[PDB]
Amino acid sequence: TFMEFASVSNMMSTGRAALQKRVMALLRRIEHPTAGNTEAWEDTHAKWEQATKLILNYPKAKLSDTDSLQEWINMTGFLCALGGVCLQQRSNSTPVSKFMDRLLSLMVCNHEKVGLQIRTNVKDLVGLELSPALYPMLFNKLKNTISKFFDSQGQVLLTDTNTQFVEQTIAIMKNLLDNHTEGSSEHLGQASIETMMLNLVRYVRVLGNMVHAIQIKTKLCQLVEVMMARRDDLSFCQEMKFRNKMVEYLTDWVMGTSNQAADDDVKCLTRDLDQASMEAVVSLLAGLPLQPEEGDGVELMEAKSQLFLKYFTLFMNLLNDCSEMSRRLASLRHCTVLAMSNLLNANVDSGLMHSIGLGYHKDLQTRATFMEVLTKILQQGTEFDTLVELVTMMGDQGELPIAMA
Amino acid sequence: INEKQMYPSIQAKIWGSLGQITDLLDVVLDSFIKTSATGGLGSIKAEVMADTAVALASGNVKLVSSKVIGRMCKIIDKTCLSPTPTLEQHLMWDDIAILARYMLMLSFNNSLDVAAHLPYLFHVVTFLVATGPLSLRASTHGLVINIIHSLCTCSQLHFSEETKQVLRLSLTEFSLPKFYLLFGISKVKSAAVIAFRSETFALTSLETVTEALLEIMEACMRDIPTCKWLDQWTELAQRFAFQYNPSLQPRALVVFGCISKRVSHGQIKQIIRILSKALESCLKGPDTYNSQVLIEATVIALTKLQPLLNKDSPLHKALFWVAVAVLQLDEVNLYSAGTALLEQNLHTLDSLR
Amino acid sequence: HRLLWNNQEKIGQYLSSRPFDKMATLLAYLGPPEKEEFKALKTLSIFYQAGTSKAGNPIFYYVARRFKTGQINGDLLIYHVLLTLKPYYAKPYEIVVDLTHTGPSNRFKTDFLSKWFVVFPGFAYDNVSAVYIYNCNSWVREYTKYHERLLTGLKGSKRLVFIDCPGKLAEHIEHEQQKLPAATLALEEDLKVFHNALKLAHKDTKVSIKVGSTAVQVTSAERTKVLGQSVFLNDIYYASEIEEICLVDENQFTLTTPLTFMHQECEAIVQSIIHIRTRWELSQPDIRPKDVPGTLLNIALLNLGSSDPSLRSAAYNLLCALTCTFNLKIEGQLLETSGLCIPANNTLFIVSISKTLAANEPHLTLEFLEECISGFSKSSIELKHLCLEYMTPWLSNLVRFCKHNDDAKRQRVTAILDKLITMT
């Protein structure tokens, strides 16, 4: 790492922000647990604790401290990129645990003197820069941080601080997952992504219909898609119930005020939310077998059939008025169709029974919306029995260029 | 044309039966083409009459197919009596445009039986690639895809499993985003959508397309031992190659060069004199936009023809200096052609040690 | 190779430095689809220690019919079998696996199979002296042959010992003290044994049929090479899931891929199965992949005629898929593709395909006519003219399904006729 932090210096730095980022990027690479690392991180963290008061309780008890704010921005990121070594050393031995606890306390801070910089900087650094070894602690702390908003009955303690925490946490998780940090794979897949996602969804449920609520919901849907994009990366004890439950939760979000809209901007935000929700649902359903939550003594086939019919009717209703925002009226059409195609491909014997009627007609669209699946849905009944050959022999070509590529 | 609602019955009854009457075929088709022309291309009459030709063809495939292909060939040949800069500007362009969609519709399900007309089909395709409005370009692409399909699904010519695999691969290849540019249909998601409704072209593209089709043909003749497709198509190209024309000859030279397998000294001399006359007209005439393309075509022909001349041909060495002179003209496309010719000439002389 | 497709947008850039065109060509035949904590305990008691063999080694019993794929996390199951092996994994032992009432719902995934092969310590596998297999069937053969590359080193070993009757296994157990649950042992009492029953299939085999009071069992008197050792096959097909039964032949009968057998008392077999299945039907508390054929032929044929080129192409490919899958004697001319410019006036083509299919494959003719008459109401005027034109060729075949003494067939024919009358 030190040897690399010589090429890191020889190359020209086009300012301090890039030099700061290049420094943290190297600090993340610090893995071997040397002793100087320990004392430097610990003492830097002590000075950071002092500057915490000096910058947070001292806009209040008295600006030129924008310089110290800039120093703090760097110093936080320093600790974040070097946080990991200490925890690694704990496994072969708790201030680092207290580091995030302060960080999460800073997460919703409201200060009379520019707390906006504080919040934006905490979001950015925590998301992009934290060491992958720090992931498990991050998730474990966020779980109980979010678990304190629901009552015992499951009644959400909706508060301005709570909602401010939630918008941020969802933004932060999106930023975290979006970036593919090196080594993140082996560290992302220890903590479960289930509980906090579920609780965030349950909280966003009651968000209402305000502009803030819809803006939060759209970001949450983007987060759901992003998280779903790496079912490989994360580790799941039960993916099936996971996906099934939140499919059943996002089904509600689509077509919320699509007919009772009274303002162009309100319907625009509503259309954006519906598009995002549909995009998320399409991502959820890929390969998701249906298994309804334990019913009222119904044979599995009977419950699956009713669930499928419910979903399919929900989709057809949306696709029925998708004919005649002009861009939206067609994009949400193929999105709705791809959703249904995802259902069927997974669910053969809960499908064609209620799906055959989609083969028939339309206003020049539904056949072009179901045979729009049959190209790879019902003509996908090829070799399903309920291929890929010579692709290896082409990769063995002279000089092996494809493997090197 | 008029009784639109009763159409599926009108055709199957009147036209599907009149078609099976072998003797009346010529008169029926002539009336078809005349009524199509009267409406003009892109007209309701033209579209309806184009569709109605599939019905007639369904009866007697051989005769309708032969008559439809032959009249296209005849019109194309007859274009060389009052030559004009491009085909789209020629007087008889409407005839070619109209009769093109006839083959487009008759292409499907081997209603243009390939095993008898493949050379002429590739003739038409070669002469039509990237011509006219967008609809016609997509039509040419669709024609190519359908003809390859039919050749891959013709029961009248048993093919090996390897040849069938080759054909299946070629059909897949022709659908890729690469060929959409080599066919002039760019920024069109589907060829079919544009085709069934009512830009500069570089000869390198035609060379690529013609080479691909030549592979498609040669794989086929690997099964039909007595086939004369290559000779027929080479001859039909050589007719246009050495014959003066503003529009056809450029394309014809590249097609001939890519197609032929054995050349003659006079052919090389004829091509070189064609280049000489083209250059002489370029310096005097103001229509450089055609003489230049003809010069480039002449060069591109040689770049392909040279590797086939006899090992004792004195022209091997003169080809170098021809390339040098071409590069001296200082034209980007001509320079590129010269550079290619130089590479080919050096490689050919090196291989001959 | 999912990532090979995933990174084709960038692999070409590195290959920009025939080979150079072949990467994108295979996208035609591509587009692939998309310490620890422990909780709960198996009330079913799938894997447990019970009984001891002659050699004085403990035997662990396992019934695969107790566990269904896709319902219970396999991490818990593997850690559980490790936990119950904690006092015994450090010493050589013996294992017996029960393969009774086993189907594809007991299949073990490749990842879970390797997780089974890894988590157990390396010496524990050498500790395994003998493996006893009871009630091997035909599903297991292909299950392990598809998983042969994972288990290529285990076939042909002495550890596997095949058991078809309880006596062979009880030979090596002290005083036949095998502690298998009574559920599996209750299926061997008082059945009917047929000695020379011939199993009719593509590969004819000489087996023995056993029809009981609850299920139907068949055993194979022909040694079958399973895992390198020629052993018999004991397939059990319960009669609670057989609903395709009829009198067909005097010496042959049809059971359900259909099951056919020949014997001198086949009527008695059918009557016994009828009695036990009707008793099961007394015990009831207070789309199939066959009818697919016609119901889809109609959807393809009607949509071919459509006025959207994309839809015509889509339907043509669907026809190719259906004909290839179901082996319809259409002369096999059709071959799938994408981007075909199928002409607008395809009335003659659809009609000719319909006539050829009606003559060559007079099989369904009832699902197809039912679907066509149902869809004839919803179609357009031009589409109605098309629909009648190819519907007409099939009505002739309806003569066949009149003579048969099947009230289900006769009532269906009556319904088709009444629908046609309403249409008229």
Interface contact C1-A391, CB threshold 8 A: yes
Q: At a CB cut-off of 8 Å and minimum separation 6, what does A14 contact?
A: none
The amino acid at C85: L
SS3 C169: helix
> How far apart (Å, rounded) are the C-alpha atoms in residues C10 and C99?
50
Structure tokens at A90: 């704990």
Chain A positions touching C19 (Cβ under 8 A) are: 397-398, 401
Q: At a CB cut-off of 8 Å and minimum separation 6, what does A215 contact?
A: A269
Task: Count CB neighbours of C256 within 10 A.
Answer: 12
Name the structure determination technique. Answer: cryo-EM
Nearest alpha carbon to residue B272 among B319, B330, B338: B319
Nearest to A352 among C75, C287, C375 (CB): C287
Element (H, E) at A45: helix A35-52
Q: Say which residue the tokens 């001292």 belong to.
A: A58
Nearest alpha carbon to residue A369 among A343, A335, A395: A335
Q: At a CB cut-off of 8 Å and minimum separation 6, what does A63 contact?
A: A113
> How far apart (Å, rounded) are the C-alpha atoms in residues B94 and B98?
6
Per DSSP, C261 falls in state E
Nearest to C73 among A238, A379, A404 (CB): A238
Mutate to test the interface with C, among B4, B7, B15 (most CBs of C within 10 A): B7
Structure tokens at A247: 């499919």
Interface contact B145-C313, CB threshold 8 A: no
Among chain A, residues having any CB pair with chain C shorter than 8 Å are 237-238, 240, 286-287, 289, 291, 345, 349, 352-353, 356, 359-361, 364, 367-368, 371-372, 374-376, 378-379, 381-382, 386, 388, 391, 394, 397-398, 401-402, 404-405
The amino acid at C47: F
Nearest to A360 among C14, C292, C378 (CB): C378
Nearest alpha carbon to residue A72 among A44, A104, A31, A97: A44
Interface contact C29-B172, CB threshold 8 A: yes
> How far apart (Å, rounded) are the C-alpha atoms in residues C235 and C210?
10
> How far apart (Å, rounded) are the C-alpha atoms in residues A87 and A91?
7
Scanning every residue of chain C, which has its alpha carbon at the shortest distance from the alpha carbon of B173? C25
Interface contact B173-C347, CB threshold 8 A: no
Interface contact C385-B192, CB threshold 8 A: no
> How far apart (Å, rounded) are the C-alpha atoms in residues C229 and C163?
12
> How far apart (Å, rounded) are the C-alpha atoms in residues B31 and B53?
11
Interface contact A401-C19, CB threshold 8 A: yes
The amino acid at C201: A
- Give the dihedral sign, CA C202/C206/C209/C215: negative
> How far apart (Å, rounded) are the C-alpha atoms in residues B251 and C334?
35
Q: At a CB cut-off of 8 Å and minimum separation 6, what does C241 contact?
A: none
Identify the chains in contact with B, defined as 3+ C-beta pairs within 8 A. Answer: C
C340, C313 in Cβ contact below 8 A? Answer: yes
- Give the dihedral sign, CA B273/B277/B278/B282: positive
Chain B positions touching C349 (Cβ under 8 A) are: 58, 108-109
Q: B-C interface: how many C-beta pairs under 8 angstroms?
A: 106
C310, B192 in Cβ contact below 8 A? Answer: yes
Nearest to B152 among C24, C331, C335 (CB): C335
> How far apart (Å, rounded) are the C-alpha atoms in residues C12 and C155?
44
> How far apart (Å, rounded) are the C-alpha atoms in residues A156 and A9?
51
Q: H/E/C letters for each residue in chain B?
A: CCCCCCHHHHHHHHHHHHCCCHHHHHHHHHHHHHHHHHHCCCCHHHHHHHHHHHHHHHHCHHHHHHHHHHHHHHHHHHHHHCCCCCCCCCCCHHHHHHHHHHHHHHCHHHCCCHHHHHHHHHHHHHHHCCCCCHHHHHHHHHHHHHHHHHHCCCCCCCCCHHHHHHHHHHHHHCCCHHHHHHCCCCCCCCHHHHHCCCCCCCHHHHHHHHHHHHHHHHHHHCCCCCCCHHHHHHHHHHHHHCCCCCCHHHHHHHHHHHHCCCCCHHHHHHHHHHHHHHHHHHHHCCCHHHHHHHHHHHHHHHHHHHHHCCCCCCHHHHHHHHHHHHHHCCCHHHHHHHHHHHHHHHHHHHHCC
Nearest alpha carbon to residue B97 among B156, B157, B150, B36: B36
3-state DSSP: chain C helix, strand, coil percent, rounded to 5?
45, 15, 40
Structure tokens at C10: 């960038």
Mutate to test the interface with C, among B172, B173, B176, B198 (most CBs of C within 10 A): B172
Task: Count CB neighbours of A195 within 10 A.
Answer: 15
Convert C400-421 to b/e letters by CB count within 10 Å (16 or more is b).
ebeeeeeeeeeebbeebeebee
SS3 C197: strand
Nearest alpha carbon to residue A126 among A110, A106, A143: A106
Interface contact A397-C70, CB threshold 8 A: no
Min Cα–Cα distance to chain C from A367, Å: 7
> How far apart (Å, rounded) are the C-alpha atoms in residues C132 and C134?
7
Pairing of strands C205-211, C58-62: unpaired
Nearest alpha carbon to residue B179 among B215, B214, B147, B144: B144
Q: Quick one: residue A292, left, alpha or beta (phi over 0 = left, psi -120 to 50 = alpha)? A: beta
- Give the dihedral sign, CA A193/A196/A201/A204: negative
Structure tokens at C35: 């310490």
Q: Say which residue the tokens 């056949």 belong to.
A: A367
Beta bridge partners of C215: C238
Interface contact B58-C348, CB threshold 8 A: yes
Structure tokens at C411: 């009532």
**Is C19 near chain A, with CB under 8 Å?**
yes
Element (H, E) at C230: strand C229-231
Q: At a CB cut-off of 8 Å and minimum separation 6, what does C57 contact?
A: C92, C93, C94, C129
Identify the chains in contact with A, defined as 3+ C-beta pairs within 8 A. Answer: C
Scanning every residue of chain B, which has its alpha carbon at the shortest distance from the alpha carbon of C383? B8
Scanning every residue of chain B, which has its alpha carbon at the shortest distance from the alpha carbon of C352? B58
3-state DSSP: chain A helix, strand, coil percent, rounded to 5?
65, 0, 35
Alpha carbon distances (Å) from C173 to A384, B154, C58, C132? 44, 68, 10, 11
Q: Say which residue the tokens 């049929």 belong to.
A: C209
Nearest to C26 among A291, A376, A391 (CB): A391
Nearest alpha carbon to residue A273 among A252, A290, A246: A252
Alpha carbon distances (Å) from C281 to A300, C112, C183, C277? 20, 38, 21, 6
- The DSSP annotation for A197-264 comes to HHHHHHHHHTT-SSHHHHHHHHHHHHHHHHHHTTTTTS--S-HHHHHHHHHHHHTTTSSSSSSS--SH
> How far apart (Å, rounded) are the C-alpha atoms in residues A170 and A182?
22
**B 96-125 → C contacts, CB under 8 A:** 104-109
Structure tokens at B119: 């050379």
Q: At a CB cut-off of 8 Å and minimum separation 6, what does A184 contact?
A: A132, A135, A233
Alpha carbon distances (Å) from C175 to B171, C168, C169, C170? 71, 12, 11, 7
For chain A, what's the residue count?
405
**Strands (DSSP E) found in A52-209:** none
For chain C, what's the residue count?
424
